[PDB]
Amino acid sequence: NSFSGYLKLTDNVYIKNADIVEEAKKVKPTVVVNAANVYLKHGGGVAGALNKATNNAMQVESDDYIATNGPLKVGGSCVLSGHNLAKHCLHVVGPNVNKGEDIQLLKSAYENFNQHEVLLAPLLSAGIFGADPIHSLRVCVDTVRTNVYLAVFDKNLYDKLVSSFL
Numbered sequence: 789n790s791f792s793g794y795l796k797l798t799d800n801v802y803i804k805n806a807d808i809v810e811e812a813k814k815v816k817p818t819v820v821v822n823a824a825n826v827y828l829k830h831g832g833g834v835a836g837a838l839n840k841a842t843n844n845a846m847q848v849e850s851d852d853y854i855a856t857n858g859p860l861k862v863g864g865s866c867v868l869s870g871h872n873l874a875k876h877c878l879h880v881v882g883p884n885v886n887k888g889e890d891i892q893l894l895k896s897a898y899e900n901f902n903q904h905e906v907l908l909a910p911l912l913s914a915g916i917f918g919a920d921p922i923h924s925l926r927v928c929v930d931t932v933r934t935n936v937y938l939a940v941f942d943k944n945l946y947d948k949l950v951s952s953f954l
């Protein structure tokens with residue numbers, strides 16, 4: 789949890805322009821959040837990147853979790869190993885608003901973060917899930933009460949989020 793180079797947005801939300809895979813390798817946090825889907829199939833975006841950085845160990849573990857427990861619900865989560873990236877991976881499902889899933893569930897998704905004192909995380913429902921990323925940061929600020937270190941890869945998006953928030 790020895791994070792460095794973050795900008796403090798609120799009492800408990802920090803942001804950095806960084807690849808979440810590189811941040812996890814440098815800090816080895818207690819918890820890294822994955823932007824997952826209900827079957828834990830890590831095909832692209834942040835999920836694909838975290839799974840590739842584990843050389844597919846995360847996907848084999850996720851498949852066994854699904855065969856034993858069934859899929860997650862939208863807004864839900866599960867805790868699995870963080871492999872070489874973290875002690876634990878918190879897999880969280882934000883709504884895919886491009887598929888008609890309710891934006892109301894983005895608040896439920898971020899509520900999962902409150903079970904952990906410190907997290908390294910991406911914005912939820914951004915990218916292929918279709919939510920506006922600045923809206924997703926606002927829900928994060930309004931819902932998360934524990935200490936969250938947000939990593940945003942794209943510099944253009946990062947600059948827009950810092951300008952809209954500060």
Ligand SMILES: NC(=O)Nc1nc2ccc(C3=C(C(=O)O)CCC3)cc2s1
Pocket residue numbers: 807808809832833834837910914915916939940941942945
């Ligand atoms: N080594 C890697 O491949 N790392 C990463 N691959 C992605 C892919 C998508 C993203 C996304 C966003 C971003 O933070 O720029 C907002 C939407 C999806 C972030 C990473 S970090």
